[PDB]
Amino acid sequence: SMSVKKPKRDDSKDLALCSMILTEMETHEDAWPFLLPVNLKLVPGYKKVIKKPMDFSTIREKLSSGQYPNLETFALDVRLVFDNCETFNEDDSDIGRAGHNMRKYFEKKWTDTFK
Numbered sequence: 001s002m003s004v005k006k007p008k009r010d011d012s013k014d015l016a017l018c019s020m021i022l023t024e025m026e027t028h029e030d031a032w033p034f035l036l037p038v039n040l041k042l043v044p045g046y047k048k049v050i051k052k053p054m055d056f057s058t059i060r061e062k063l064s065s066g067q068y069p070n071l072e073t074f075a076l077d078v079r080l081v082f083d084n085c086e087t088f089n090e091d092d093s094d095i096g097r098a099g100h101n102m103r104k105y106f107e108k109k110w111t112d113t114f115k
Contacts (some may be wrong), residue, residue, distance in 0.1 A: 003085060014071045017020040021109045025078070026056055028105060030098040035079050050088060071114065078106055 026033060037055045040047045059077050068074045085099030 006103055010073070015063075016067070018071060018074045019048050021106070022056065022060060022063060022078075024109060025106060026060070026103065030096060031056065033085065033095045033098050034102065046088065050084050052080060052084070054084060056081065066103070074108060075110060082106075 026035065031073050034056050036057050038050070038053055039047050040053070046053070059074070059081070062068060062076065062077065068077075082099050082103040085095065089096040089099065091097070091100070
């Protein structure tokens with residue numbers, strides 16, 4: 001509360017570490033469904049159904065331009081990418097499996113880097 005603070009967690013490397021994680025996600029072989037924004041002209045249903053589209057390139061640009069105030073807002077957008085994928089794709093599809101795999105990959109890197 002006012003003039004009562006928990007000890008200051010060092011957050012000075014967060015930006016670099018989120019960039020590193022994002023690089024590892026970008027270079028995973030199953031990243032291909034997530035690298036670029038879904039083409040809203042070419043994919044029926046996407047625009048109406050997925051209220052907040054997110055992809056790795058968009059996260060990368062937000063990251064690079066100081067649009068994440070903290071590491072939780074970064075994780076929210078990453079998870080949004082996988083939540084959107086599960087919303088739109090069957091579990092038993094290449095893309096559906098890609099999303100589960102990438103989410104797993106991300107969550108491990110996240111825990112190992114920060115928790």
